[PDB]
Amino acid sequence: ARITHSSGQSFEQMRQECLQRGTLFEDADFPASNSSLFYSERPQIPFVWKRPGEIVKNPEFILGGATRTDICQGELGDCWLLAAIASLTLNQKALARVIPQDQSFGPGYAGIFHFQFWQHSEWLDVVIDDRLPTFRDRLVFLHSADHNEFWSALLEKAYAKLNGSYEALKGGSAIEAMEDFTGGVAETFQTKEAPENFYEILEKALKRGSLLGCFIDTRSAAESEARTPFGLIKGHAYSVTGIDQVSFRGQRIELIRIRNPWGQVEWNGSWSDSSPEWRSVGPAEQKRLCHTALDDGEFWMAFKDFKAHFDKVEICNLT
Amino acid sequence: ARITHSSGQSFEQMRQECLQRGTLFEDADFPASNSSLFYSERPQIPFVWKRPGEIVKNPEFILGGATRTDICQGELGDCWLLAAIASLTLNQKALARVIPQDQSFGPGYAGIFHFQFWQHSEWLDVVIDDRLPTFRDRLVFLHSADHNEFWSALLEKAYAKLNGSYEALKGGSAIEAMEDFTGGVAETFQTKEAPENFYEILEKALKRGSLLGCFIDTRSAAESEARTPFGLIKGHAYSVTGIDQVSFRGQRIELIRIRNPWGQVEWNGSWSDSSPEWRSVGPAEQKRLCHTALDDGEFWMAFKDFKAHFDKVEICNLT
Ligand SMILES: [Ca+2]
Ligand SMILES: [Ca+2]
Ligand SMILES: [Ca+2]
Ligand SMILES: [Ca+2]
Ligand SMILES: [Ca+2]
């Protein structure tokens, strides 16, 4: 997994230098300054770059696992990246490949973190300092639901460095991030002209750890990010996170679980969090599907309704 | 003060009608919706509109007075308007003409406020409902340093209404806002080529209750909001909030006081907060000038250096 830092130095070497000298790592290739935020204009607010220790008393890299509940979009149009990350978290092992072991703020910590991305035919080590964009003592971009947790915020920073700025992450394709996390090639399915066995294709893809996404087509640039009356977002990358079934009126009903990378704002029809359908599903069956009422961005849908409401599904296999 | 609402009704009439029915006022002319936020478009993130009661438990309109410390800019390039508001706060009679007298969340509260702006030949009375943009339970745009204080956030909303949207306020003229708050006649001075009597003109103007701003020239529009090594923001409207002489190492140095509408990020050099100049200064002259070290936005500088680094000074005189 190839060194890409301009020093030519390795993540462990640079880390070890800092520990010996007793300083924190400052990244010479992606500085904590305005050009790493935006290229098209300076920001209108006083951004202050801060290490996680300067943000909370007790920072932690991973806390309670690196999970999809840790992907909450900030003020950046990178729904496509984060949906890819949330999808990546369903495979512990595809995740360990993008996120090298034993990173923390405990012993060994020198202000330096590293992540692995697949670019162009290869696996790059991308090294960062943990100084993050803040405003009013808060992260502005990607944050975990738990404000003591920084792995998602750092991964996004590393990915922003990959693309030269945070602004370059505005608008993209889930496939781009999916490929960058896996080194696979993404297949696009088109929701209303999908094979007869489309459900089985997704079930089996999810089971072997493939990254699944889906989205609603936007007819015009005017329609981007429009909330439909059903509580869905147009032109917005969602993670497909579950494929399952329940008995309803004594029939098997094919369900699909979807996650908004915002971490909130959800479907409001059949099998949504507070819909009537659930009152006639018992507690065992319901605990198995992990159904709860929470505005966490994750909801179930009937696969039939999913196909009708969404327009595209992407599958990216691991290898 | 001219009625401006499509209903033809006054502030008092809509207010009495609302508490007659036991409801909260929704403004037909400036709805809590995207049209009121942007015009090319949407936010990349779900702003929810919340009344101050839904944001904070004990909301209040004014607290500790309506002062310039209540003007901390949010995520919007309306420094020009904010610099003007802060300037306005130093003349309490002028400020009362923009902000009607008995507004609060106490008895008679009905989700309805109003402000008054001079538009060319008449004062306009501009009514709003107090639904304000928030994201992650925090106001996004203008907010007081005290989170339970909403007058300035409200003023900015109402001023956004006057201009059609919150986006309308991105970029603007400080003289325009100063004249809208006062009805006075503007006066621009070029700092480098000003009268050999300029310091007194400013002192007289500030004492007179006039509004004063200052700013540095933008070469490019791509230079807008760039920082100097001295910690000033280019293309950025400041309020001039104090003029005062002090004695220091034998001479008398003319000092000027300036405030960033960010409420944060200040001058670096001589006479800055944590500059050594102050030590040579008695504690009796220190607490007259209100010298403290805190990231106020607000700072003193030596008049020579003010001329040296700022380009234009705008005064809005009532007399
Ligand atoms: Ca976690
Ligand atoms: Ca949910
Ligand atoms: Ca106050
Ligand atoms: Ca800069
Ligand atoms: Ca200060």
XYZ file of C-alpha atoms and ligand atoms in Angstrom:
643
model
C 0.000 0.000 0.000
C 2.024 2.891 -1.507
C 3.422 6.002 0.267
C 2.076 9.223 -1.351
C 3.325 11.972 1.037
C 5.693 14.588 -0.553
C 8.311 13.962 2.148
C 8.426 10.354 0.859
C 8.172 9.384 4.506
C 5.853 6.614 5.821
C 2.882 7.052 8.186
C 4.786 5.180 10.962
C 8.036 7.135 10.360
C 6.391 10.575 10.385
C 4.320 9.515 13.373
C 7.421 8.289 15.204
C 9.416 11.440 14.467
C 6.598 13.506 16.002
C 6.418 11.263 19.072
C 10.192 11.475 19.602
C 10.339 15.290 19.053
C 7.147 15.570 21.093
C 5.193 17.613 18.565
C 1.968 17.080 16.653
C 2.077 16.254 12.953
C 1.355 19.185 10.624
C 0.534 18.077 7.078
C 2.613 20.013 4.533
C 0.540 18.679 1.539
C -2.967 19.597 2.777
C -2.559 22.640 5.051
C -5.071 23.696 7.722
C -6.140 26.776 5.722
C -8.689 28.334 3.376
C -7.481 26.784 0.108
C -8.114 23.265 1.505
C -11.757 24.267 2.235
C -12.795 26.039 -0.996
C -11.042 26.846 -4.352
C -13.865 28.929 -6.003
C -14.025 31.579 -3.227
C -13.031 32.122 0.373
C -15.660 31.202 2.944
C -17.874 33.916 4.443
C -17.424 32.600 8.045
C -14.401 32.410 10.443
C -13.368 28.768 10.109
C -10.964 27.679 12.826
C -9.072 24.440 12.257
C -9.011 22.341 15.422
C -7.634 18.990 16.553
C -10.287 16.701 18.104
C -8.675 17.269 21.563
C -9.337 20.998 21.141
C -12.991 20.205 20.226
C -13.910 17.776 23.072
C -12.196 16.827 26.293
C -11.910 13.115 25.433
C -11.578 12.460 21.685
C -11.805 8.918 20.299
C -11.177 7.621 16.788
C -13.709 4.749 16.882
C -16.239 4.506 19.674
C -18.841 1.735 19.751
C -17.629 0.508 16.371
C -17.239 2.323 13.053
C -20.902 2.150 12.072
C -23.381 3.741 9.772
C -24.869 5.647 12.765
C -21.534 7.526 12.634
C -22.246 9.029 9.173
C -24.079 12.395 9.543
C -23.647 14.853 6.635
C -22.389 18.356 7.340
C -22.629 21.435 5.158
C -21.222 19.926 2.024
C -22.900 18.247 -0.926
C -21.051 14.922 -0.516
C -24.074 12.631 0.095
C -22.456 10.370 -2.517
C -19.235 9.886 -0.476
C -20.968 9.322 2.846
C -23.527 6.866 1.449
C -20.475 4.928 0.206
C -18.921 5.085 3.714
C -22.167 3.965 5.391
C -22.362 1.090 2.931
C -18.687 0.298 3.568
C -19.368 -0.039 7.318
C -21.638 -3.142 6.734
C -18.496 -5.115 5.840
C -16.028 -5.019 8.804
C -13.270 -6.242 6.596
C -13.778 -3.987 3.547
C -13.780 -1.191 6.183
C -10.464 -2.392 7.780
C -8.896 -1.946 4.376
C -9.789 1.723 4.044
C -9.193 2.273 7.806
C -5.869 0.776 9.111
C -5.971 -0.718 12.590
C -4.933 0.843 15.907
C -5.558 4.481 15.338
C -6.595 6.324 18.436
C -5.984 9.321 20.638
C -4.412 7.080 23.292
C -0.783 6.019 23.590
C 0.987 6.468 20.235
C -1.042 9.531 19.238
C 0.877 12.304 17.347
C -1.870 14.235 15.522
C -1.527 11.959 12.464
C -4.027 9.528 10.855
C -4.014 7.557 7.598
C -6.533 5.908 5.300
C -6.217 3.731 2.186
C -8.044 4.557 -1.045
C -8.027 2.857 -4.412
C -6.797 5.139 -7.108
C -6.203 4.584 -10.310
C -5.080 1.014 -10.469
C -3.634 0.899 -7.073
C -3.919 1.191 -3.230
C -2.720 4.578 -1.931
C -1.758 5.404 1.640
C -3.206 8.848 2.292
C -1.817 10.416 5.438
C -3.466 13.436 7.262
C -3.141 15.575 10.348
C -6.281 15.559 12.552
C -6.901 19.350 12.442
C -10.555 19.638 11.356
C -12.683 22.541 10.018
C -14.791 24.066 12.790
C -17.071 26.989 13.372
C -18.561 27.913 16.737
C -16.628 24.982 18.296
C -18.336 22.506 16.035
C -17.500 20.409 13.053
C -19.169 21.882 9.943
C -18.721 18.874 7.655
C -19.049 15.129 8.438
C -19.630 14.269 12.091
C -20.616 11.161 14.054
C -23.922 11.114 16.020
C -21.605 10.906 19.032
C -19.626 14.173 19.130
C -16.663 12.440 20.809
C -16.017 10.312 17.672
C -13.817 11.460 14.779
C -13.041 8.544 12.404
C -15.815 9.540 9.929
C -14.745 13.243 10.029
C -11.122 12.287 9.456
C -11.922 9.810 6.632
C -13.835 12.622 4.865
C -10.872 14.950 5.372
C -8.524 12.338 3.889
C -10.934 11.935 0.993
C -11.142 15.743 0.603
C -7.311 15.782 0.499
C -7.524 13.038 -2.190
C -9.607 15.387 -4.293
C -7.554 18.538 -3.502
C -10.247 20.336 -1.408
C -13.459 19.885 0.612
C -15.246 21.801 -2.175
C -14.234 19.121 -4.753
C -16.431 16.712 -2.736
C -19.518 18.811 -3.663
C -21.559 16.835 -6.158
C -20.341 13.440 -7.342
C -21.246 9.797 -7.849
C -21.549 7.088 -5.211
C -19.762 4.835 -7.717
C -16.672 7.062 -7.524
C -16.405 6.602 -3.735
C -17.581 2.961 -3.895
C -14.799 2.137 -6.389
C -12.260 4.127 -4.343
C -13.073 1.997 -1.257
C -13.066 -1.351 -3.010
C -11.079 -1.342 -6.260
C -14.105 -2.983 -7.921
C -16.209 -1.790 -10.856
C -19.714 -0.570 -10.204
C -22.743 -1.889 -11.981
C -25.823 0.306 -12.381
C -29.258 -1.084 -12.315
C -32.139 0.789 -13.360
C -35.032 0.352 -11.051
C -38.059 -0.074 -13.352
C -36.303 -2.182 -15.987
C -34.520 -4.574 -13.630
C -34.369 -8.336 -13.943
C -37.204 -10.504 -12.637
C -34.779 -11.722 -9.921
C -33.607 -8.154 -8.939
C -34.513 -8.650 -5.282
C -32.375 -11.858 -5.087
C -29.524 -10.013 -6.890
C -29.541 -7.329 -4.143
C -30.003 -9.782 -1.251
C -27.025 -11.833 -2.491
C -24.913 -8.697 -3.198
C -25.562 -7.387 0.324
C -24.727 -10.798 1.830
C -21.313 -11.112 0.161
C -20.472 -7.581 1.402
C -20.938 -5.543 -1.812
C -21.618 -1.802 -1.485
C -25.174 -0.935 -2.493
C -26.586 2.520 -3.240
C -29.638 3.982 -4.890
C -31.133 7.312 -5.853
C -33.986 9.251 -7.403
C -33.274 10.875 -10.807
C -33.498 14.625 -10.988
C -35.294 15.819 -14.181
C -33.461 19.162 -14.040
C -30.746 20.891 -11.989
C -33.695 22.843 -10.439
C -34.917 19.622 -8.802
C -31.626 18.735 -6.935
C -32.221 17.944 -3.249
C -36.013 18.433 -3.491
C -37.988 16.757 -0.718
C -40.847 14.661 -2.135
C -44.155 14.506 -0.135
C -43.141 10.931 0.844
C -40.111 12.329 2.764
C -37.538 11.216 0.145
C -34.775 13.405 -1.359
C -34.239 13.773 -5.129
C -30.707 13.716 -6.639
C -29.356 12.411 -3.324
C -27.186 9.337 -2.717
C -28.770 6.807 -0.283
C -27.124 3.669 1.128
C -28.977 0.397 0.694
C -28.290 -1.259 4.095
C -30.719 -4.187 4.413
C -32.714 -6.767 2.426
C -35.387 -8.781 4.254
C -38.957 -10.042 4.528
C -41.976 -10.135 6.826
C -45.327 -11.792 6.932
C -48.087 -9.196 6.345
C -51.803 -10.143 5.970
C -50.416 -13.682 5.788
C -48.281 -13.062 2.687
C -44.512 -12.788 2.507
C -43.682 -9.088 1.790
C -40.261 -8.260 0.387
C -38.732 -5.341 2.310
C -35.606 -3.220 1.571
C -33.768 -1.019 4.130
C -32.394 2.345 2.976
C -30.289 5.027 4.779
C -30.151 8.784 4.228
C -26.493 9.919 4.667
C -27.886 13.009 6.452
C -28.684 10.683 9.388
C -32.287 11.951 9.421
C -35.299 12.731 7.161
C -37.011 9.556 6.094
C -39.685 7.899 3.979
C -43.198 8.382 5.383
C -45.249 5.593 3.674
C -45.652 1.827 4.205
C -43.069 0.303 6.622
C -41.722 3.728 7.571
C -40.933 4.137 11.268
C -44.431 4.984 12.545
C -46.631 3.436 9.815
C -49.613 1.199 10.679
C -47.948 -1.851 9.070
C -45.697 -2.365 12.159
C -48.537 -2.683 14.751
C -49.267 -6.116 13.179
C -45.645 -7.355 13.310
C -44.750 -9.066 16.564
C -41.769 -8.226 18.792
C -39.604 -11.217 17.794
C -39.992 -10.461 14.078
C -39.502 -6.802 14.762
C -36.350 -7.209 16.864
C -34.951 -9.318 13.995
C -35.516 -6.517 11.489
C -34.177 -4.014 14.070
C -37.265 -1.834 13.688
C -37.381 1.243 15.908
C -38.938 4.727 15.694
C -35.923 7.049 15.284
C -35.194 9.913 12.911
C -31.771 8.351 12.206
C -32.085 8.381 8.357
C -32.683 4.631 8.195
C -36.038 3.196 7.177
C -37.645 0.121 5.671
C -39.695 0.137 2.450
C -41.704 -2.444 0.557
C -39.464 -3.468 -2.317
C -42.384 -2.743 -4.703
C -42.590 0.895 -3.470
C -38.773 1.199 -3.541
C -38.696 0.211 -7.193
C -41.465 2.756 -7.940
C -40.001 5.679 -6.015
C -36.318 5.230 -6.723
C -34.804 5.247 -10.217
C -31.205 3.891 -9.846
C -29.390 1.230 -7.854
C -25.563 0.793 -7.864
C -23.781 -2.415 -6.871
C -20.046 -2.447 -6.359
C -18.508 -5.820 -5.471
C -15.487 -6.222 -3.277
C -12.362 -7.940 -4.405
C -44.156 54.089 9.563
C -45.810 52.559 6.505
C -47.646 49.207 6.511
C -46.094 46.797 4.023
C -48.064 43.530 4.491
C -50.305 42.141 1.713
C -53.152 41.782 4.229
C -53.242 45.599 4.690
C -53.333 44.947 8.448
C -51.016 46.465 11.053
C -48.571 44.696 13.382
C -50.992 45.255 16.266
C -53.989 43.955 14.243
C -52.319 40.738 13.187
C -51.019 40.269 16.779
C -54.424 40.760 18.446
C -56.014 38.481 15.828
C -53.464 35.751 16.636
C -53.860 35.725 20.420
C -57.679 36.137 19.947
C -57.543 32.692 18.276
C -54.725 31.397 20.555
C -52.366 30.711 17.631
C -48.912 31.776 16.397
C -48.432 34.175 13.466
C -47.362 32.771 10.136
C -46.232 35.431 7.672
C -47.903 34.913 4.273
C -45.368 37.286 2.566
C -42.169 35.571 3.734
C -42.897 31.912 4.381
C -40.743 29.568 6.482
C -39.588 27.824 3.271
C -36.725 27.514 0.749
C -37.990 30.476 -1.320
C -37.299 32.644 1.783
C -33.811 31.065 2.148
C -32.263 30.829 -1.347
C -32.852 31.399 -5.039
C -30.344 29.162 -6.536
C -30.842 26.555 -4.619
C -31.385 24.316 -2.107
C -29.247 23.898 0.935
C -27.188 20.761 0.921
C -28.555 20.090 4.337
C -32.020 20.044 6.027
C -32.657 23.472 7.647
C -35.683 23.253 9.877
C -37.467 26.476 10.762
C -37.963 26.872 14.495
C -39.515 29.561 16.635
C -37.144 30.654 19.450
C -39.308 28.681 21.934
C -38.658 25.491 19.943
C -34.880 26.267 19.912
C -34.313 27.352 23.512
C -36.490 26.861 26.603
C -36.525 30.477 27.908
C -36.255 32.650 24.783
C -35.921 36.408 25.143
C -35.889 39.301 22.650
C -33.325 41.557 24.348
C -30.826 40.634 27.147
C -28.095 42.872 28.656
C -29.381 45.565 26.298
C -29.325 45.482 22.503
C -25.593 45.806 22.100
C -22.920 45.131 19.491
C -21.831 41.954 21.385
C -25.129 40.504 20.137
C -24.016 40.735 16.515
C -22.167 37.465 15.732
C -22.404 36.621 12.077
C -23.756 33.274 10.879
C -23.233 31.495 7.569
C -23.886 34.416 5.313
C -21.749 37.105 3.730
C -23.725 40.015 5.154
C -20.905 41.697 7.152
C -22.056 45.017 5.567
C -25.504 44.769 7.214
C -24.101 43.498 10.522
C -21.366 46.138 10.709
C -24.218 48.655 10.242
C -26.382 47.039 13.024
C -23.455 47.043 15.443
C -22.689 50.641 14.527
C -26.378 51.399 15.131
C -26.276 49.888 18.639
C -24.038 52.782 19.908
C -26.856 55.337 19.368
C -29.766 54.025 21.464
C -32.319 56.569 20.152
C -31.498 55.684 16.521
C -31.753 51.971 17.393
C -35.202 52.456 19.009
C -36.429 53.851 15.670
C -35.498 50.578 13.942
C -36.600 48.300 16.809
C -40.132 49.053 18.240
C -40.253 49.340 21.953
C -42.297 46.664 23.788
C -41.444 43.436 22.011
C -40.801 40.273 24.050
C -41.823 36.637 24.590
C -43.832 37.557 27.704
C -47.554 38.408 27.894
C -48.808 39.466 24.457
C -46.352 37.177 22.596
C -47.936 35.665 19.426
C -44.953 34.686 17.246
C -44.931 38.100 15.593
C -42.288 40.838 15.579
C -41.688 43.954 13.482
C -38.820 46.271 12.510
C -38.640 49.625 10.728
C -36.392 50.553 7.816
C -35.921 53.820 5.999
C -36.579 53.242 2.328
C -35.728 56.344 0.306
C -38.530 58.654 1.522
C -40.510 56.696 4.142
C -39.968 54.375 7.049
C -41.348 50.903 6.278
C -42.798 48.671 8.933
C -41.673 45.136 8.194
C -43.352 42.335 10.105
C -42.050 38.799 10.429
C -42.991 35.640 12.220
C -40.167 34.401 14.442
C -39.581 31.065 12.693
C -35.853 31.223 12.073
C -33.566 28.917 10.056
C -31.801 26.355 12.224
C -29.668 23.310 11.567
C -28.707 20.780 14.252
C -30.794 22.758 16.817
C -28.673 25.918 16.285
C -29.372 29.153 14.410
C -27.472 29.154 11.129
C -27.365 32.882 10.367
C -27.126 35.875 12.703
C -27.178 35.123 16.426
C -26.302 36.854 19.679
C -23.350 35.660 21.795
C -26.085 34.840 24.349
C -27.978 31.876 22.849
C -31.275 32.897 24.577
C -31.283 36.314 22.754
C -33.115 36.667 19.400
C -33.567 40.391 18.503
C -30.601 40.518 16.121
C -31.472 37.186 14.472
C -34.948 38.591 14.017
C -33.753 41.957 12.650
C -31.679 40.081 10.065
C -34.649 37.928 9.065
C -36.821 41.027 8.631
C -34.004 42.664 6.618
C -33.778 39.500 4.513
C -37.567 39.852 3.968
C -37.099 43.446 2.728
C -34.636 42.127 0.112
C -36.611 38.990 -0.806
C -34.503 36.203 0.713
C -31.537 35.407 2.996
C -29.410 34.900 -0.189
C -30.191 38.474 -1.303
C -28.042 39.552 1.656
C -24.854 37.900 0.359
C -22.649 40.836 -0.577
C -23.817 44.406 -0.163
C -23.166 48.039 0.676
C -22.476 49.194 4.231
C -23.727 52.694 3.357
C -26.906 51.147 2.047
C -27.634 49.432 5.447
C -26.558 52.488 7.501
C -28.944 54.742 5.526
C -31.727 52.136 5.899
C -31.252 52.248 9.706
C -31.074 56.050 10.069
C -32.316 58.090 7.085
C -29.038 60.033 7.150
C -26.735 61.177 4.321
C -23.606 59.036 3.702
C -20.021 60.199 3.600
C -17.077 58.207 2.233
C -13.484 59.177 3.079
C -10.414 57.689 1.402
C -8.128 56.873 4.355
C -4.834 57.524 2.510
C -6.064 60.795 1.019
C -8.256 62.231 3.799
C -8.282 65.754 5.283
C -5.363 66.710 7.589
C -8.138 67.021 10.203
C -9.671 63.532 9.801
C -9.327 62.087 13.338
C -11.502 64.883 14.825
C -14.097 64.433 12.085
C -14.428 60.778 13.105
C -14.439 61.556 16.849
C -17.087 64.237 16.425
C -19.105 61.893 14.123
C -18.937 58.961 16.576
C -19.900 61.128 19.586
C -22.732 62.705 17.482
C -24.416 59.246 17.166
C -23.491 58.812 13.509
C -22.746 55.328 12.122
C -19.188 54.673 10.961
C -17.805 51.769 9.023
C -14.467 50.948 7.410
C -13.048 48.351 5.062
C -10.122 47.232 2.917
C -10.282 47.198 -0.876
C -10.912 44.056 -2.877
C -8.834 43.728 -6.037
C -10.482 40.632 -7.473
C -13.702 39.321 -5.887
C -11.451 36.246 -5.531
C -9.700 38.401 -2.875
C -13.036 38.862 -1.025
C -12.722 37.609 2.580
C -8.942 36.945 2.309
C -6.998 37.510 5.546
C -3.922 39.704 5.934
C -0.891 38.636 7.977
C -2.133 41.360 10.392
C -5.413 39.437 10.883
C -7.740 41.755 8.966
C -10.303 40.533 6.474
C -10.271 42.132 3.027
C -13.556 43.026 1.310
C -15.100 42.946 4.755
C -17.224 45.636 6.471
C -16.147 46.617 9.972
C -17.897 48.904 12.457
C -15.881 51.767 13.938
C -17.036 51.686 17.611
C -14.704 53.999 19.518
C -12.214 56.822 19.103
C -9.846 57.820 21.901
C -6.434 59.315 22.647
C -4.022 57.722 25.135
C -0.556 58.569 26.496
C 2.116 55.937 26.225
C 5.921 56.122 26.531
C 5.899 59.940 26.518
C 3.864 60.634 23.378
C 0.068 60.690 22.950
C -1.038 58.077 20.491
C -4.408 58.541 18.847
C -6.258 55.219 19.071
C -9.245 54.020 17.017
C -11.534 51.086 17.819
C -12.899 48.676 15.231
C -15.117 45.603 15.324
C -15.362 42.568 13.041
C -19.117 41.616 12.615
C -18.004 37.959 12.856
C -17.687 38.665 16.558
C -14.295 37.046 16.326
C -10.883 37.277 14.539
C -8.942 40.468 15.200
C -5.993 42.732 14.460
C -2.478 41.336 15.204
C -0.159 44.283 15.604
C 0.338 47.148 18.008
C -2.496 47.776 20.500
C -4.172 44.433 19.769
C -5.632 42.510 22.751
C -2.497 40.609 23.751
C -0.059 43.147 22.436
C 2.596 44.515 24.782
C 1.605 48.187 24.217
C -0.907 47.912 26.973
C 1.510 47.256 29.753
C 2.850 50.738 29.331
C -0.699 51.842 30.109
C -2.242 52.638 33.513
C -5.155 50.542 34.808
C -7.291 53.717 35.118
C -6.897 54.460 31.361
C -7.342 50.732 30.565
C -10.743 50.276 32.070
C -11.980 53.566 30.581
C -11.125 52.285 27.113
C -12.590 48.833 28.189
C -9.414 47.007 27.131
C -9.789 43.337 27.785
C -8.207 40.410 26.008
C -10.970 38.439 24.378
C -11.827 37.301 20.878
C -14.519 39.945 20.665
C -14.276 40.879 17.024
C -13.439 44.214 18.632
C -10.009 45.722 19.046
C -8.071 48.963 19.251
C -5.441 50.041 16.816
C -3.186 53.102 16.508
C -4.769 55.634 14.178
C -1.594 55.748 12.012
C -1.885 51.994 11.345
C -5.648 52.261 10.736
C -4.898 54.736 7.908
C -2.066 52.425 6.821
C -4.176 49.258 6.478
C -7.777 50.344 5.802
C -8.758 51.994 2.553
C -12.229 53.469 3.058
C -14.201 54.852 5.990
C -17.936 55.435 5.554
C -19.945 57.771 7.849
C -23.714 57.943 7.942
C -24.635 61.244 9.628
C -28.069 62.152 10.992
C -26.618 65.694 11.573
Ca -19.334 4.733 16.490
Ca -35.375 5.468 11.236
Ca -27.695 41.532 24.515
Ca -6.851 32.897 2.724
Ca -11.040 41.737 21.360
